[PDB]
Write a protein that holds these residues in place. Structure first.
Motif, short mmCIF file in Angstrom:
data_model
loop_
_atom_site.label_atom_id
_atom_site.label_comp_id
_atom_site.label_asym_id
_atom_site.label_seq_id
_atom_site.Cartn_x
_atom_site.Cartn_y
_atom_site.Cartn_z
N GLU A 144 152.85 40.25 14.24
CA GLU A 144 153.46 39.56 15.09
C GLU A 144 152.90 39.56 16.60
O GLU A 144 152.90 38.61 17.23
CB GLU A 144 155.00 40.28 15.25
N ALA A 145 152.38 40.55 16.81
CA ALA A 145 151.48 40.56 18.36
C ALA A 145 150.70 39.62 18.48
O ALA A 145 151.03 38.50 19.18
CB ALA A 145 150.69 41.80 18.20
N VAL A 146 149.61 39.23 17.75
CA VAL A 146 148.66 38.49 17.75
C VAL A 146 149.16 37.10 17.13
O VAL A 146 149.60 35.97 17.36
CB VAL A 146 147.36 38.49 17.24
N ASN A 161 153.39 44.20 9.83
CA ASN A 161 154.36 43.05 10.51
C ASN A 161 154.21 43.12 11.99
O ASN A 161 153.77 41.96 12.63
CB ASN A 161 155.82 43.51 10.17
N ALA A 162 154.11 44.23 12.68
CA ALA A 162 153.81 44.41 14.12
C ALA A 162 152.62 43.79 14.39
O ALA A 162 152.76 42.71 15.14
CB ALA A 162 153.96 45.74 14.65
N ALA A 181 156.26 51.57 2.12
CA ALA A 181 157.19 50.89 3.00
C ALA A 181 156.76 51.12 4.49
O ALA A 181 157.24 50.43 5.45
CB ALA A 181 158.68 51.58 2.86
N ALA A 182 155.84 52.03 4.73
CA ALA A 182 155.42 52.39 6.01
C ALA A 182 154.32 51.26 6.40
O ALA A 182 154.48 50.45 7.35
CB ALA A 182 154.55 53.68 6.17
N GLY A 183 153.19 51.23 5.73
CA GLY A 183 152.11 50.30 5.97
C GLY A 183 152.71 48.92 5.96
O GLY A 183 152.41 48.17 7.09
N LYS A 184 153.46 48.38 4.98
CA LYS A 184 154.06 47.31 5.06
C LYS A 184 154.54 46.80 6.42
O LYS A 184 154.01 45.92 7.02
CB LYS A 184 155.23 47.12 3.81
#
Length: 33
Positions: A31-33, A27-28, A20-23
């Protein structure tokens, strides 16, 4: 002799985050790029 088997347990107890961490991590950056 409380606790005991904390290293083997924790590591196995943190295995949840591990995934659940990497997943949620990709996402971040995604989302950034």
């Amino acid at each position: 002799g409380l606790w005991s088997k904390i290293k083997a347990a924790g590591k196995e107890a943190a295995k949840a985050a591990a995934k659940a961490a990497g997943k949620a991590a990709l996402n971040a950056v995604s989302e950034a790029v």
